[PDB]
Amino acid sequence: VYTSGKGSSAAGLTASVQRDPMTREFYLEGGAMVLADGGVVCIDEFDKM
Amino acid sequence: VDDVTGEKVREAFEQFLEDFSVQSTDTGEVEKVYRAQIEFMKIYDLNTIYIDYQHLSMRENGALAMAISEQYYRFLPFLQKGLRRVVRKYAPERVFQISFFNLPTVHRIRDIRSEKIGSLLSISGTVTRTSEVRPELYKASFTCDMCRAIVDNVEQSFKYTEPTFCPNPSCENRAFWTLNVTRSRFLDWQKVRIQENANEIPTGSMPRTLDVILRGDSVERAKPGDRCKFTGVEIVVPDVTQLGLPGVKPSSTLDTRGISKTSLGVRDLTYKISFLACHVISIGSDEINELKEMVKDEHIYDKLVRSIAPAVFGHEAVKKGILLQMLGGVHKSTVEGIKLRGDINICVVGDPSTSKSQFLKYVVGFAPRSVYTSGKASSAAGLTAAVVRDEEGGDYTIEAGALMLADNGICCIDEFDKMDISDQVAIHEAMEQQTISIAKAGIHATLNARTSILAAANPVGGRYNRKLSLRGNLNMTAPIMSRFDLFFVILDDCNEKIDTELASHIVDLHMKRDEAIEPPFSAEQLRRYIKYARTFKPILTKEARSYLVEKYKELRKDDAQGFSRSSYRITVRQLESMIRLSEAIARANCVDEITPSFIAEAYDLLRQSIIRVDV
Amino acid sequence: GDFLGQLITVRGIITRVSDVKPAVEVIAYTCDQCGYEVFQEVNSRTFTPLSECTSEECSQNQTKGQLFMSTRASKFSAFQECKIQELSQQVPVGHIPRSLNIHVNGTLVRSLSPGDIVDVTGIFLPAPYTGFKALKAGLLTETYLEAQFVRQHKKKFASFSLTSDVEERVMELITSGDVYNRLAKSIAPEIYGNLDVKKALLLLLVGGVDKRVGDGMKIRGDINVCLMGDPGVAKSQLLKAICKISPRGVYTTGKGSSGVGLTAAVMKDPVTDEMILEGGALVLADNGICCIDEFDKMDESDRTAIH
C-alpha cells in the first residue's frame, strides 16, 4: 500500500474507527496499516507529517 | 320581507346608476359619466367596472351607504343581477366584478376584530412572499352517470363537491358526481400574504402576518416589497391546527329529537380570519415648465451639491458620491455576449465618532428601492432565497429575500468586518456574476440582482495608523477590495473655525427655531428631477477619448515612483471607471456628447480621492 | 421478576421528579331530561366520552336525551412520577446504575426532593405496554412501583417541630460541658491537626443570619471559605466530610461539569407536559453547601457564574 501523507487521499493512514450512521454500530474503518497486514507499507514525506 | 329588503336595495341601485352621475358643468367632466364607462367597456371588451364610493355617499343622504357597507357578502348576487339587467338594456359569457374604491377611513391590522365581519375596510400594509397563478372551478357540470350528466350547478361557494338535490335523473339523493374537467368556466387567483407596516407597530412587539386572496382583475398587480391598499370583504377560512389551544371550542352534534326509532357524524369547527380583496392600488403638464426651469440654469450641479442633507455639516465629496450613485450608468449590452457594468460602488471607510450612519439614514430615508440593513444578524439567507416549501402541495415558493428586492436601487450594508465568510462569497458572487445560484434542499434555481452597494466599515485599530498602508486597515478579503471605487477616508482635526461652525450648527439643529437652513431646491422636486434625468442614455461623440487616454497615462506617471504610497497598479478598471463617472456627471448636467472638461472633473475627483488614500 | 404483587422496600437516589397535575378517577355527567347523574370509572391511560344515556328512564323510551359533563362533581387525585437510580455503592465490579419508575398518589405528594437518599416502601404492580410492535411476543408487561410510605435518611431541617423527647439527647450534649470545641473536634476526626480549619467550618455549617431592611434589599447571611496550600495537608477529606454531614450538599470536581451542567438547561418532558427547566448542580443544592475541587482549572464562563 502506497500512502504519501499526511493521509492519502480520502483515506487516513492509521486505524480509525467510524460509527455506522445506520444501526449506530462500531466497525473498523480502515487506514493504511490494517489493509496491508503481512507486508510492506511505503511512505513519502515522513518528516512533513 | 328580507327578499323585499335586498330586492328593494337592488332596484334602488339600478335607479342609482341609471340616473345622473356628474354634477359638474360644461367645464368638466361632462355627463354622464357611467354610460361612457359601459360603452367604453363595450369598445374594448374587458368586462369590469370601477365605481366610486363617494358618489354613492352623496345621493341617498347615507341611507343606502349604510346598507351595502355592512352586509356586503349577502348582497353580491342581487347587485350583480341588477347590473346585468342594465347591461341587457343598453348593450349586447359575462363575468362582472364590482370593485369599490376611495373609502373614508383606513384601518391597520391591529384594528381587526370579529365584530367587523362581512363589512368593507381599507387595509394598508406590505407585500412579502407572493405565490403563483392557478385556476379555480366555481362552475360545475356534475351529475350521475345513470343517466343524465349535464347539470350546470353550484360550488360557487367553496365546498367543493357535490350537487345534492333533484338527482340524478334518475338516481336520487344523494347520488352525485363524477364531475367534468372540460365543461366549466374557470378564473385564476393567487394568494399574496401581507405583512404589517414598519412605522406603526406598538412598542414593543413583533410584526404580524395576514393572508389575502386576489381574484380576477387584480392578479399580478401586487409587487414584492411595496405598499398597497386593498378592498374589504373579509371572509372566514376553515382552520385545523388550533386544537389543544385550550378551548372550550364548540361542536355540532346533530339533533335526533325528531326521527323516531324502532351514526355519530358529529364535527369540529375552528376558524381563522383571512381577507379577500379585488382592487389593488400601489400608492406608497404644469411642472414640466418647472423642469424647464431646472434645465436652463447653469449652477444646477452646485445646487445639487449644496442641497442633499442639511443636517450634515462638513465635507462634500461623500455627498457628490451619493448623488452619483442615485444616477446610474448606461448598463448597456455588448457584443455578443458579456454585458458591461454598469453601476457604481462607493464604500465609506472611516473612524467611529464620525456620524457615517446619518448618510445611510438619509439615503434609505429618501430614495425609492432602498433597503437598510445593519448586518450582523443578516444571517445567511437572509440575503438569498430560502426556498419556502411547502404552502399546500408543491409550493416551491421563493422568499423576498433581503439583497434581491432592492433591484435598481441602493442596497446599503453596514460593517463588513463583523460578517463572516459565506456572506463575502454571496457578495462577491453578487458583484461578479450579476446573478445568484441556489441549490437549497430540493428545488434547484437561479435568480438575478442589479444593485448598488454602499458600505460603512471600520478600521482594525479603529483609528489611523497614517503610517500604515490603507490595505492594512480593511480586515476584509482581497478580491472584493478590487471591485470598490472609491474609498473615501474620513478623519477630522482641531481647527477653531471648524470647531465653532460645527458647534453653532449642531446647537442650531437642536433648535426647532431655526430649522430654516433652507436648501435652494425643495424636497420633492429633486426626486422629480431624478426621474427626468434617468431617461437620457447618452453615447459620447467626442474625439477627446484619446485625451482621456493620456490623462490616464499622466495619472499613471506619478504613482510609478514611488510605491511607498498606496501601491496600486493602477488598475485598468480605473480607466473603465472614468467612463461611468463621466457618464454620471453628464446625466446630472442634462448634457449629452461629453466634453473633456467633465473628464477633468471626475479625474480630479479620483485624484484627490486617492490623495485621501495615499498618506 | 418474581416479586410482582408483594410489599417490598428499595433504596437509591431520586432523579427527575416531575410536577403535580390532576388525573381523573370518575367522571360525572348530567342528563338534562331524565335528571340522572351517569357516572363512569376510568382505569386506563386514555378514555373516551359517551353518548345518549344509560339510565333506566332515558332508556326504554323513544326519545333518548343527550349528556354533557361537569367538573364540580367528579373525583380528582394528585399525581406525580419520578425515578430511582441505583445507589452506586451496591453495584458489582463492572456495571452501570439502572432505574425504576414510581407513581405517587394522594397525600404523600411533595415529599420527594431531587438529589437525596431515600427508603421507599411500596407494592409492585404491572402496567401494560411493549415497545416497538415488531418486538412483541405476548404478553410483555413493563413494571412500576407504587408508593406507600417514604422514609429519608439525612432528615432535612427545618421540617421538625417536636422538642420534648429531643432534649433527652440534646441536653446531654449541653450538660456534657464545652460543647463548641467538642463539636469542632467532631467534624472529620480521622485526620490530625488543623483545629482552626475545623473551627471555621463549623461556622460555615451554622451560617446565618439573613436580614430584610424593608426596601427590600437583602443581605447575607452566609459565609464563603477558600482553602490554599498543596498537596499533603488532606484537604479533600474535609470536602467529602462536610459535603457528607450537611443535607443537600453537592460535590463537583473541576472538569467535570460544563458551563451548561451547573446552570440549568431546557429539555422536553415525557408524559407530563411541557418544557420544564431541568436544573443543574447549583440549582439542585440551594440552601446548602456546594463543594468545589480544583478551582483554577475552571473555564472562564464558570468563573462569571460563580461571581
Add this chain to the structure above:
Amino acid sequence: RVTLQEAPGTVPPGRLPRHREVILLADLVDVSKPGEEVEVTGIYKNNYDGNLNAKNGFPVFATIIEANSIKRREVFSWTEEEEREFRKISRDRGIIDKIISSMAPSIYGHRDIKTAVACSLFGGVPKNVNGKHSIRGDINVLLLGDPGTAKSQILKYVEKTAHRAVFATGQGASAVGLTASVRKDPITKEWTLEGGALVLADKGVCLIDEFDKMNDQDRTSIHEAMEQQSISISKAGIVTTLQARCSIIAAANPNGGRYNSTLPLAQNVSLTEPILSRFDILCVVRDLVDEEADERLATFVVDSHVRSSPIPQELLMKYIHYART
C-alpha cells in the same frame, strides 16, 4: 419529466422567474442538456386530483405543459474531405506561430505563455516501458499571475477550446472540489460514489486557480494526483483505486504586492517545495509601468469599450482533436 423555468436574462426588473412542468415522451427523450436554452411547442392541460374530500377552500388544479416538439435556441469530428484537406496545411513551415497567433485575440502580446498554453493542451506520448513503469505523458503548467492580468481570459478560452475540460474552483465553491467522496444525492436518494474533478477530467485538462486559499485536504489530493496517477478511497464501505491521468493548468497569485522582492519564486510565493517539484513550466507576468504597453494596451481598451492571419476556431479545434487521437 423535466421542469422548466424562465430565462434569467430578459426578466423585467423587480420580479422573479417561475416554474412550469414539462412531460416528454418517446422520441424526444435525451435531446436537451441542462442549464441551456430550449424551445417548446406544447399543449396545455390540467391534472385531475387525488381524492376530493373535506379540505379547506379552495379547489385548485395544477397545470402541465405536455410537450410535442423541442428545439435548441432559436458533435465535431472529421469526414474524408477534411482528412484529405487536412494535409495541405500540414506541410507549411510557418504553421507554429500561426497556431500561436490564432489563440487569443484579446491579449495583445505574451507570446511565450501562449506558446506554453498551446504545448500544454496539445499533448504528449504517455508512455509504457516494458514492463514495469510509465514516466509521464502530460504537461503541467504553473502560471504566476498578478491582479491586473488577463490570465482568466486565457484559461477561460482554454475551457472553450478542448475536448473534455472541467473548470473547478477551489473554495466558495462550485462542484466539485477535487475530492472524491461517497455522499447522498438530493434528487435521487440512493448513495452515489461521486468522483472528484481529478477523477472526472481523465485524458483532458483541469483548471485550478488561486492556490493560496485551499485546505490541506485538497492539497493532499493534488499531491496524490501528480504522484502516481491514482486516487484511492476507503470510506465508508468501499475500497477502490480509481485512475486519474489529468493535466493541470494553474493560475497563481503573489503575496501582497505584485513581485515582492528580488527573491526567487519559492521564496516569493507562499506555496511549498513538493508542489513546486512536480510543475514543469513556470510563467511570470510583467511589468512595471512602461510607455508602449500603455499606448497599445489603452488604445485596445477604448477600442473595446466604444463598441456598444488566424484560422477560425472550428478548424483548429478539429485539428488538435484529430492530432491528439
Add this chain to the structure above:
Amino acid sequence: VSDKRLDVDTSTIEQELMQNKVDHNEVEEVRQITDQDLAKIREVAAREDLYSLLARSIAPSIYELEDVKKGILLQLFGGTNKTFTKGGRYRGDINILLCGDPSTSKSQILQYVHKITPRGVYTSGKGSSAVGLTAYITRDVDTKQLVLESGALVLSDGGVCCIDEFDKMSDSTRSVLHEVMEQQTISIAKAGIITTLNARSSILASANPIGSRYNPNLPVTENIDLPPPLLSRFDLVYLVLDKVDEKNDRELAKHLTNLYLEDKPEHISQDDVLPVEFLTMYISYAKEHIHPIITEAAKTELVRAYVGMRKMGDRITATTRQLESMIRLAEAHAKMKLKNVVELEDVQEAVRLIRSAIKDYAT
C-alpha cells in the same frame, strides 16, 4: 397595569394606544394624579435644597457618590422628546458607565434601579449571544407552529437596561451596541422577518479593571480593556476609587451598625426627611406636563465651554457626543423644578457633573 410603588410609564411611547382605547371603555394604564397632594407637589417644589434632597433620598442604604446618585436621578428625567417634520426623531436617552474597584456596592445600585424601573431587563456578561438579544424564532408546543419571540432589548423598550461585566463580552456581542447606542434602531434581516424595529432604552453598565485596585501613574484608558472610541461614546463615565484616610470610616461603620441594630427598618430618620412614594408621582408628573426649551441666552456659555473643551490636544478626548451630552443633560436638569425654559444659570453644574470625574482623572 399601573401600580403605586414602582414608576409610571411614559407618554410619548403610549400615544398609539392613546389614539386607540377611546372608542371602547377600558382600564387606566396611567397612575391617576389626585388633587389634594398636588398642592403638596407645588409646596415641595418651592424647597431650595431639592437638588440634594431628592438625590439624597434615592438609595438610603448606600452612602457616598452623590454625583453618581445625582446622575442616576438624571437618568430618570431623560431629555426632551422632539420630533421633526421628516427625519430627526431625537430621544432623551442618556447612558452611564460606572467602574472602579470592587467591594464598592456596584450591585446594590443595580438591584435598586432594577426594582424602580417600569420595564427593566437585567442581563449579564458571558451569558449573551447575538441571537440572545432578539429574534428567538422557535417552535411553540401547544399549537405546533413557528412563532417568533422578542429577545432581550425589545423587552427593554423604554426604560433602563442593565449589564454587568462589560469587559468580558465577545466581539459579536458588543457589536450589537454600535447600533443601539448610535442609530436608535435594530435591523433584523434573517429568514423570518426583514423589517427594522426600534428599541429606545437607557443602557447602564459596569466593569471591573485588571488590577483590581486602580493604581496611580497609569493611563485611565489603559486600565479598562475597551477601545477608547467606544469608551468615548458613553455620556457619563464615573471612576470611583478609594481613599486611605481615616475620618470617613467611623461614620461608615456607624451607619452599618446603625442598620443592624433594633431589628426594625429605621435606617435614616436623623437628621433627614425622606419621601417614601412622593417621588414616583413627582417624577411622572415631571415627565408628562413639562416641555423644556433651551433658547438663546445660554448658547454663548454653552458653545464657549465646548470650544474651551476642544482646547486640550497635543488618554480620553472630547467629541460632539459631549455637546449632545451637555444639551440633553442640561435640559434634563431643567425638567426638574418645574421650569418650561432653561436659564443661563444651572448650566454650570451641568458642566460640573463631567468636571467631577475630570477632577477624578488627575491622580
Add this chain to the structure above:
Amino acid sequence: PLRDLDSEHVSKIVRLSGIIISTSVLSSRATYLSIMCRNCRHTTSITINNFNSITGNTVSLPRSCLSTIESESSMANESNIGDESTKKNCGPDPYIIIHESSKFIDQQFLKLQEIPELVPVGEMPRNLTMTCDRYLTNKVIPGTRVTIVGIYSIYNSKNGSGVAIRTPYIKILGIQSDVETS
C-alpha cells in the same frame, strides 16, 4: 453502455459493465414448504422453482381448505358431516406453514453504478438494482469492476408520481469479475 437503455430492450439478454457500490443483507426465500388446515386438519405440500418476481408474489398459500375437491366418497362424507345440516368450511385463508420440515435459499440485492469517467460532466451518475440467485450470493466485495449478463425486467412497487410508471431492474444470470484484478 449504461447510458442508452431504451424500452425496446425489455426482457432480452443484455450485458453491461459498471462499479458495484454496496451490497445488502442475506435474506431467505422458501423452496419446499408443507402446510396444514387449522380447521379441516388436512396436509399438502408446495414446491416453487423460480423466485424473482419480487412484488408478485411468485405464489401464495391457497385461500380455501381444498378438501372439497376430492374424488372419494367417505372423505366427502366426513367433510359433509362436519356440521349437522350445512356444509363445513375451513375458510377464509386457513393454512399454516409448518417450519420444522421445510427448506430455504438465499437472495442478495446488490446495487450498481456506471463508471465515473464518462460522461457525467453536467449530470449526476445513474444507477440500477441487481438480484442474485442461490450460488451467486456473497461472491463480490463492493468495489470491483464487473460485467453482468442479465435480463432487463420490470417490477411495480411504489417510489420513495403517475400515471402508469414502472421502475426498471435487472435479474442476474450470472456474474463474472475482472481477471483478477486483486
